[PDB]
């Protein structure tokens, strides 16, 4: 219906730059600094490997059949040739994992031979890790005194080599494998070698890593399904061993020719061949278990640091499973939780079966009719299932390490990358998870992929990564990944939201990084950006990119001048979005750093002038930036600006005005910035300069993913309003009940100067003559809160208003100097933040808020009515009043957006339509005393008629301005000294106050509905400023307050 004029949908100052309780983020504060935990630079190398082999052949030791070793029958060859080949084979077997390392072998050695082997290996790989593989099958079991067994020259005795001496021969960076019976014995010994302490864990200190085959009591298998070399064949030949075990156990074995497993086609590298694809699934499977099973710290040490240790610990998880079947429990030193029968070996078993069937027909002919396994598709689908259902901090996704393996193959690259970004989007915790898995380098390498299929996903991934960890700068530049996004800025690939991301990603690459500045500068990133300057988030970020690109790097500063960046940036200082303007001020501010004119002076003058224009901006966000850019400028021109401060106490006298203006800004964070600028000049080494905040706040947009109860309490208030609009109009309003429903003591010494009844709750807001604010409840008889609107010495209250009444009210507090301060949560006992504060009028200020249009009209003893659009936080218009005397009163019509009424000092009255080219509609005298228009307002209704024109003379003149100039109706409320007027919003009712203690209420036709007489509490005889009268906006309640100390509420029974 028509009553949607009464019920405006505009909401204002409820954006992210105005944020509340647990974030002072909004601006002023610096950005939230992080401290990363995924940082181990030492990609360790195992440089030397020492294979020892104690197997006396046809000579069982006295602790006693399977006897295959390194997949060789040692009884097929004769003992010495047997042992040569096993020596070689087992080298080759390891060699495949770390082929860039030296392998030395020792066959049935002396303790001296093992000494030198170990001593030389330590001397070879100085800091690099040394691997000691030991095989004691043909010698006795390790002892409780901690002893390996070896030989003497003649092979007549078994000699015990004590573990202590090994540990002295090799040192810190080393890893041992023990394929023998009773292997724990060796680890229990190792643990006892050093003095306990030196860690905050189970029991460690050094970098000694240990892998043992079985427990203390246990003995390696004898069954012929296994070899003697089980643990080593798991650890070192995992695929071959994993399948041979699969045959002999699961499918019962005799159907499948087990010797096909030796002859599996292709190589371990080609993921397109059946062997390599099986090898790839195994790596993926194993790595995945380790990730889910372990913690961050241990996983990264074993599974990510050393290519060999990674492989040995991956392949160890297979030993965990195979050895378990043969009465053996293997243990590593970094102990690791139980791995066998994880829900993922199931996936391996399935992939192995599907492989092993196919192997039968692929031998019949090399058809290469090799169907890739579904495994990689299936798992990525399980990652999608996670991303919808349970998609929280409800334990990690498990498939994450498999998504990383997929990035290594074009086969599912796109859908992996897609699903990765989907995962990265849900917050920094997910980025932390991705980067823990080791996503960084593969996603970084992909920044050389020309495939435009990818790029829109890659920018989105790199946006999210850089949103968390700023520090990736260094890598991105070092591989030339900066070029990738500069292309994407210039690319014909549409969508400016994607380009803001591209501009942001570059902003971060550049941010305090001269290697990145220069490398982007060469790549024409100034030119790319300035080409686009000819959507708001994109504009915001084009400026922040450029701002960072010049900053303290004067080669770029020059390149920007001769590319006319001032000429292209400055037009953004007028844009409706504060976020753009503040970013534009940042860019121009960072372009900085007698009678002389060189190129730069022309620029640096033209800059500062265009910034000084924006000193009086309606957004703190902007003013904060202007004050910082002025501080920068001020640093370099102390000399001049001090001489400017001498004569005040060409362009330098402009600056000093603006400093002292900033110093007395309403928003105290802007104020304390202006006071900083003043101290840089010496009014009361770079480190003293305040620092821009706009970059830091904007970046928080990306670190954040890219409702119904909102509308619930919205419709609550609308229903109540519509119902109580009708009830105000259509009720036959009776006489005033002189019995008040309070006479509340404010404790204001001089008394109450203005008040404001709340629509949807039982609240009064009052105001002292020095702008203290109380929030008195009338239904509870209780205070809700107190205040001091601004600590400045010159006080004076002008206006109280509500803003966004229909969803969480914000209290506007206009000061008599034209300062306007808006408060959130004023109703709460202590918590109440200044949302925004600017200075309208640039005296006796008068102000009015028109929620319909979002306009704040303001004026006073000035030639002009100044208009503010609070959606933009911008001074939209200066209307000349055309009076040559002061605006005493100012009412904006709630129904008709743009239209404005104004009462004047000489008794005159004026309409304006502020949206018209000529804004003054008409100008009428009404009442004829030449005293000032104390109060006025539009008649409660849906027309441009007016109650208006209570003059201090005493007459309240009604008038309709569609028809005639003179007065519709006159009422003589008071013989002189009309101190206040209250007109209702919907109910046909008004009231007026006198300086003769007196209040009067009239029907809209003008019947004495009731008189009231505020009496004095002592004989001051100064109830001469009955200053506040104000109705409820949906009921017939009357609040009233004087030059005494009481705020009394009445009603109409």
């Amino acid at each position: 219906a028509t009553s949607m004029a009464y019920l405006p949908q505009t909401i204002v100052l409820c954006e992210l730059r105005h944020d509340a309780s647990e974030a002072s983020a909004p601006l002023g504060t610096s950005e939230i600094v992080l401290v990363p935990k995924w940082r181990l630079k030492e990609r360790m190398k195992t440089g030397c490997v020492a294979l020892v082999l104690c197997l006396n052949i046809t000579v069982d030791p006295p602790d006693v059949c399977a006897r295959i070793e390194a997949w060789i029958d040692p009884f097929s060859m004769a003992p010495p040739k047997a042992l040569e080949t096993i020596g070689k084979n087992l080298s080759t077997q390891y060699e495949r994992w770390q082929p860039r390392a030296r392998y030395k072998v020792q066959l049935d050695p002396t303790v001296d031979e093992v000494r030198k082997l170990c001593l030389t290996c330590r001397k070879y790989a100085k800091t690099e890790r040394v691997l000691f593989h030991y095989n004691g099958h043909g010698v006795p079991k390790p002892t409780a005194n901690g002893e390996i067994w070896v030989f003497n020259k003649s092979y007549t005795q078994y000699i015990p080599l004590p573990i202590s001496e090994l540990d002295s021969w090799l040192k810190t960076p080393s890893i041992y494998v023990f394929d023998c019976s009773a292997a724990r014995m060796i680890l229990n010994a190792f643990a006892e070698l050093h003095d306990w302490g030196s860690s905050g864990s189970s029991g460690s200190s050094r970098d000694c890593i240990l892998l043992a085959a079985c427990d203390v009591h246990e003995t390696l298998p004898q069954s012929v399904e296994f070899p003697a070399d089980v643990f080593t064949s798991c650890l070192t030949t995992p695929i071959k061993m994993a399948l041979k075990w699969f045959c002999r156990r699961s499918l019962l074995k005799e159907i499948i020719d087990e010797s096909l497993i030796d002859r599996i086609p292709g190589r371990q590298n080609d993921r397109k061949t059946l062997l390599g694809e099986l090898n790839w699934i195994f790596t993926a499977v194993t790595d995945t278990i380790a990730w889910n099973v372990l913690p961050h710290e241990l996983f990264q040490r074993l599974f990510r640091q050393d290519l060999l240790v990674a492989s040995l610990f991956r392949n160890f998880l297979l030993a965990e499973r195979i050895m378990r079947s043969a009465n053996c429990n293997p243990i590593s030193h970094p102990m690791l939780p139980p791995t066998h029968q994880h829900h993922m070996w199931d996936a391996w078993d399935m992939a192995a079966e599907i492989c092993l069937s196919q192997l039968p027909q692929l031998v019949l002919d090399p058809s290469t009719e090799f169907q890739p396994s579904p495994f990689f598709t299936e798992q990525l689908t399980a990652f999608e299932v996670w991303l919808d259902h349970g998609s929280e901090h409800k334990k990690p996704p498990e498939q994450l390490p498999i998504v990383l393996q997929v990035l290594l193959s074009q086969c599912h690259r796109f859908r992996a990358l897609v699903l990765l970004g989907r995962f990265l989007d849900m917050g920094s915790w997910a980025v932390d998870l991705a980067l823990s898995v080791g996503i960084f380098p593969y996603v970084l390498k992909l920044l050389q992929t020309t495939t435009n299929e990818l790029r829109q996903i890659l920018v989105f991934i790199w946006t999210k990564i850089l949103a968390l960890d700023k520090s990736c700068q260094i890598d991105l530049v070092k591989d030339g990944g900066h070029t990738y996004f500069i292309r994407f800025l210039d690319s014909s690939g549409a969508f400016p939201e994607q380009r803001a991301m591209a501009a942001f990603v570059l902003a971060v690459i550049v941010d305090g990084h001269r290697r990145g500045q220069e490398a982007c500068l060469e790549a024409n990133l100034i030119g790319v950006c300035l080409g686009h300057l000819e959507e708001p988030l994109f504009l915001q970020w084009l400026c922040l990119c450029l701002g960072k690109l010049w900053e303290d790097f004067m080669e770029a500063q020059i390149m920007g001048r001769e590319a006319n960046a001032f000429e292209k940036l400055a037009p953004l200082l007028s844009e409706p979005q504060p976020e753009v303007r503040a970013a534009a001020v940042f860019a121009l501010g960072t372009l900085l750093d007698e009678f002389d004119d060189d190129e730069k002076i022309r620029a640096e003058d033209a800059i500062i002038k265009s910034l000084l224009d924006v000193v009086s901006d309606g957004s703190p966000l902007v003013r904060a930036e202007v004050a910082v850019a002025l501080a920068r400028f001020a640093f370099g021109h102390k000399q001049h600006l001090k001489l400017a401060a001498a004569s005040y106490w060409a362009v330098y006298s402009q600056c000093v005005r603006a400093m002292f203006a900033l110093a007395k800004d309403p928003s105290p964070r802007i104020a304390s910035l202006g006071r900083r600028v003043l101290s840089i000049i010496g009014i009361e080494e770079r480190s003293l300069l305040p620092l821009s905040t706009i970059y830091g706040w904007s970046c928080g947009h990306f670190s954040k993913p890219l409702s119904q109860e909102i509308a619930a309490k919205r419709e609550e208030k609308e229903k109540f309003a519509l119902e109580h609009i009708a009830k105000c109009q259509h009720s036959s309003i009776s006489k005033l009940n002189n019995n008040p429903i309070a006479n509340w003591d404010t404790r204001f010494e001089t008394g109450t100067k203005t008040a404001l009844l709340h629509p949807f709750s039982p609240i009064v807001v009052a105001a002292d003559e020095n702008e203290r604010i109380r929030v008195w409840n009338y239904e509870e008889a209780t205070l809700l809160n107190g205040f001091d609107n601004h600590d400045f010495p010159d006080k004076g209250i002008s206006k109280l208003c509500l803003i966004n009444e229909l969803d969480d009210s914000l209290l506007l507090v206009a000061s008599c100097d034209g300062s306007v301060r808006i408060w959130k949560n004023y109703a709460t006992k202590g918590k109440q933040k200044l949302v925004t504060g600017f200075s309208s009028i640039q005296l006796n200020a008068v102000v009015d808020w028109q929620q319909q249009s979002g306009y704040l009209y303001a004026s006073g003893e000035t030639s002009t009515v100044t208009l503010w659009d609070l959606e933009k936080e911008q001074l939209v218009r200066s209307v000349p009043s055309e009076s040559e005397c002061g605006v005493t009163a100012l009412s904006a019509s709630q129904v008709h957006g743009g239209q404005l009424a104004a009462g004047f000092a000489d008794g005159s009255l004026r309409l304006y339509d502020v949206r018209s080219p000529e804004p003054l509609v008409c100008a009428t005298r009404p009442h004829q005393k030449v005293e000032r228009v104390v109060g006025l307002s539009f008649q409660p209704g849906l027309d441009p008629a007016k109650v208006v024109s209570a003059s201090q003379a005493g007459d309240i003149q009604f008038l309709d301005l569609r028809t005639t100039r003179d007065t519709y109706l006159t009422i003589d409320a008071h013989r002189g000294s009309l101190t206040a007027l209250a007109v209702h919003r919907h109910a046909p009712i008004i009231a007026s106050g006198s300086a003769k203690q007196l209040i009067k209420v009239f029907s809209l036709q003008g019947e004495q509905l009731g008189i009231i007489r505020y009496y004095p509490s002592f004989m001051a005889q100064k109830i001469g400023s009955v200053s506040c009268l104000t109705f409820h906006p949906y009921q017939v309640l009357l609040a009233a307050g004087a030059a005494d100390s009481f705020v009394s509420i009445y009603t109409h029974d």
Binding site: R43, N269, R271, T283, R304, L307, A310, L404, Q405, L407, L408, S409, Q410, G438, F440, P441, Y442, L444, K445, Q448, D475
Partner: peptide, 8 residues
């Protein structure tokens, strides 16, 4: 930045 190979 390594450990697992990528095809290029």
């Amino acid at each position: 930045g390594g450990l697992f190979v990528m095809d290029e």
